[PDB]
Each structure stands twice: as C-alpha cells, then as structure tokens.
Amino acid sequence: IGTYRHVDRATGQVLTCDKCPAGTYVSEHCTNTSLRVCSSCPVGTFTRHENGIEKCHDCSQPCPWPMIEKLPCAALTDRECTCPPGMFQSNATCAPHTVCPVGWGVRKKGTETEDVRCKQCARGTFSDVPSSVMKCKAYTDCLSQNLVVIKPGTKETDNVCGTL
C-alpha cells in the first residue's frame, strides 16, 4: 500500500501517511505519534483506488427506466447503467432488438449498444421461428441418417427425412 504527504495542522510538519484502500477514505490523518485512520465509504458514496481523500465520491443519479444497473453504487464503484437484455441503446434510451423473421437468422449477436444483425438463411440452412437470438440451423442430414429426402427444405423449414 502507498503513501501521501500531509501537512500537520498543529505543528506544520509535513508527514508521510499511509493511503487508505479503495472503498475507504481518510477519516483522521496520521500525526507524529499515531497512524492515519480509514473509515468505509458511507452508503451513496465510493472511492475507486487507494487514496488519501477526506470524503468519498458521490454516486451518479439513479438509472432512468428502462435502464438498469450492471454495476451498483458500492464502496468501490459508481453505479453503471445499461439497457436490459434484449434491448440496445439508441440515442436517448432503449429499443428492443430486431427480431429476425422466419427464413433469416442472426449474423451478429445484439449487444447493450448495438442491435442484432440478420441475414437470410444460406442454402442448406433454415430458421423456422422468429427470434432475435437464433442462428440459421443446417438441415438434418438425411444421407447420414439411413433415410432419404422425402420433401426438400426451404429457408424456413428443415428437409423431411424417411424411406421408399
């Protein structure tokens, strides 16, 4: 743990005190005969690193709905807001991800900051359900199934497998 210089009120001595760890602040500086005392950051406040400060930092305002906290206001961290899962941030607030329709599939997973990117299923794959998450699935292999392709598949359906 590191140190900081402090000027002693009563004597004018420049002391070398021990820093307080992240999550605490200095509630009593060291003097020529006693060590500095650290206290924990009160509710509502934080300090990110080992410090010598006298009051902890204030946490930001609460997250504006529909945003939620991916980090809380705690001793060591300011609160951090995010759009909840299945939404992404655009301008002001939160929009739901694109839902890829049947016959399309996710090419790029949507994130808290970018929307999902869809592509039409390529030949040999299909997607049969609307989803903002699912990829195009490859057809069931009929050859390696001991069966044959009764009905071909489409970008929306699997091929159907059987005999004769």
Report, in Å, the least distance between residue 43 CB and a copy of itself.
Answer: 8
Only segment of 4-12, 74-82, 115-123, 135-143 that touches a copy of itself (CB under 8 A) = 74-82
For a copy of itself, the binding residue among 77, 89, 125, 132 (CB under 8 A) is 77
Token reading at 94 = 């939160």
Q: Looking at beta carbons only, is 10 or 43 nearer to a copy of itself?
A: 43
Report, in Å, the least distance between residue 79 CB and a copy of itself.
Answer: 10
Cis peptide before 66 (omega within 30 of 0): yes
63 alpha carbon, distance to own chain's centre = 14
Residue 38 is classified by DSSP as: E
φ, ψ of residue 145 in degrees (nearest 5): -130, -10
Residues 103-162 that bind a copy of itself (CB under 8 A): none
Residue 82 in the binding site for a copy of itself (CB under 8 A) = yes
The beta-carbon contacts of 150-156 under 8 Å, at least 24 apart in sequence, are 153/126, 154/103, 154/126, 155/103, 155/104, 155/120, 155/121, 155/125, 155/126, 155/127, 156/102, 156/103, 156/126, 156/127, 156/128
Alpha-carbon distance 79 to 9, whole Å? 35
Alpha-carbon distance 156 to 3, whole Å? 66
Residue 60 in the binding site for a copy of itself (CB under 8 A) = no
Residue 75 in the binding site for a copy of itself (CB under 8 A) = yes
Q: Looking at beta carbons only, is 72 or 124 nearer to a copy of itself?
A: 72
Per-residue x/- mask for a copy of itself, residues 1 to 40, rule CB under 8 A? -----------------x--xxxx--------xxx-xxxx
Q: Looking at beta carbons only, is 85 or 152 nearer to a copy of itself?
A: 85
Residue 69 in the binding site for a copy of itself (CB under 8 A) = yes
